[PDB]
Amino acid sequence: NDDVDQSLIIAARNIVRRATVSTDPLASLLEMCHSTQIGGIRMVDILRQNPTEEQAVDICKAAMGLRISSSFSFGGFTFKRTSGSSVKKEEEVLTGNLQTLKIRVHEGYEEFTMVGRRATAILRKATRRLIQLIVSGRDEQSIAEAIIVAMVFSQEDCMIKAVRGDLNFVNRANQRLNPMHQLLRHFQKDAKVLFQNWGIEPIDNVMGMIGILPDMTPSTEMSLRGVRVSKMGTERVVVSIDRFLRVRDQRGNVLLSPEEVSETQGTERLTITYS
Ligand SMILES: C[C@@H]1CC[C@H](C)[C@H](Nc2nc(-c3c[nH]c4c(F)cc(F)cc34)ncc2F)[C@H]1C(=O)O
């Protein structure tokens, strides 16, 4: 099965990337899936009978009415809300480069798990407030990637004020990214100002936990505010899909879009063919 999964992910990612530049991505994706075989089996037959939950695969599943994980993706991390709730309120904010953004601010206490390939975390937040991030990962760089995502997701003003360029990122089709993705793409390029402005704090000696400093080095004495490093680290639902491959749950939350599909290329172990 792991080898079916590997080839299915490659096929689905290639299809989503190609579809995104078409005038009608949903129609393009459906035609490509209909015409693709993996190991000589119709891709649609694999999608119906394969439990993989990767972002591109789940976009393809949604397009043909299959149930998918209720979790969402941000920065490539799968987020599962484990406690709490939030309501959205539009607010206008001013970045550190004097650009205004209209952001859907989430109001309420929430806890999430974040699962990525190289790091995992527990994130506890309230309105525009990161409370705790307990993160585990393969190295300090992988941990830093999760921290950046969590700091942007928190919607904190100090993150908004750490922006140092204009935000005009677009997708493959030259469509402007939404504000949360604008902020994320900015800080993925360079997080030094974000990390230097976030704040540090002293930590207590807790077995299995350590701090991480703005320079991404470990410390037993201090850490980025709210952040601790640990050595320790889903229901399927009906979703909707639209022309531009935005996948929403029944309550309208945007679980997936092409912006959350990895750019990683790979070489399939089962032949992918196209008729
Ligand atoms: C990816 C887009 C940007 C961020 C994520 C991916 C959005 N999707 C969802 N966000 C939430 C959510 C809960 N609490 C939040 C918070 F405190 C801050 C925040 F930014 C989002 C949330 N819950 C379910 C979702 F499906 C997508 C969008 O809305 O465009």
Between CA 67 and CA 243 the distance in angstroms is 18
Between CA 154 and CA 225 the distance in angstroms is 13
* CA–centroid distance, residue 150 to ligand 1 (Å): 11
Which atom of ligand 1 is closest in space to residue 255's alpha carbon?
26
Q: The tokens 């919607």 sit on which residue? A: 155
Residue of minimum CA distance from atom 20 in ligand 1? 153
Contact between residue 43 and residue 66 where contact means Cβ atoms under 8 Å apart: no
* CA–centroid distance, residue 232 to ligand 1 (Å): 26
Task: Provide the 3-class DSSP secondary structure of residue 163.
Answer: coil
Between CA 47 and CA 15 the distance in angstroms is 13
Which atom of ligand 1 is closest in space to residue 105's alpha carbon?
18
- Annotate 70-127 with DSSP letters as a single string: S-EEETTEEEEEEEE--EEEEEEEE-TTS-EEEEEEEES-EEEEEE-SSEEEEEEEET
Between CA 35 and CA 29 the distance in angstroms is 10
Contact between residue 240 and residue 6 where contact means Cβ atoms under 8 Å apart: no
Between CA 257 and CA 46 the distance in angstroms is 21
Residue of minimum CA distance from atom 27 in ligand 1? 254
Between CA 55 and CA 181 the distance in angstroms is 16
Closest CA to 261 of 4, 27, 25: 25
Between CA 143 and CA 141 the distance in angstroms is 5
Which atom of ligand 1 is closest in space to residue 127's alpha carbon?
17
Alpha-carbon separation of residue 32 from 55, 149, 247, 260 (angstroms): 17, 32, 18, 20
What resolution in angstrom units was achieved for this structure?
1.4
Contact between residue 224 and residue 147 where contact means Cβ atoms under 8 Å apart: yes
Residues 6+ apart with CB under 8 A from 80: 70, 71, 112, 113, 115, 234
Consecutive H or E run containing 200: strand 200-202
Taken in order 229, 235, 236, 239, is the CA torsion positive or negative? Answer: negative
Return the number of other C-beta atoms located less than 10 Å from residue 253's C-beta: 13
Beta bridge partners, 224, equal: 200
The burial of 80, by beta-carbon neighbours within 10 Å (0-12 exposed, 13-18 middle, 19 or more buried), is given as: middle
Residue of minimum CA distance from atom 12 in ligand 1? 106
Closest CA to 180 of 251, 87, 106, 114: 106
Task: Provide the 3-class DSSP secondary structure of residue 141.
Answer: helix
Contact between residue 123 and residue 83 where contact means Cβ atoms under 8 Å apart: no
Closest CA to 245 of 15, 25, 54: 25
Determine the residue type at 86: S
Helix, strand, coil share (%) of the chain residues, nearest 5: 30, 30, 40
Alpha-carbon separation of residue 90 from 34, 42, 103, 152, 179 (angstroms): 40, 44, 6, 16, 11
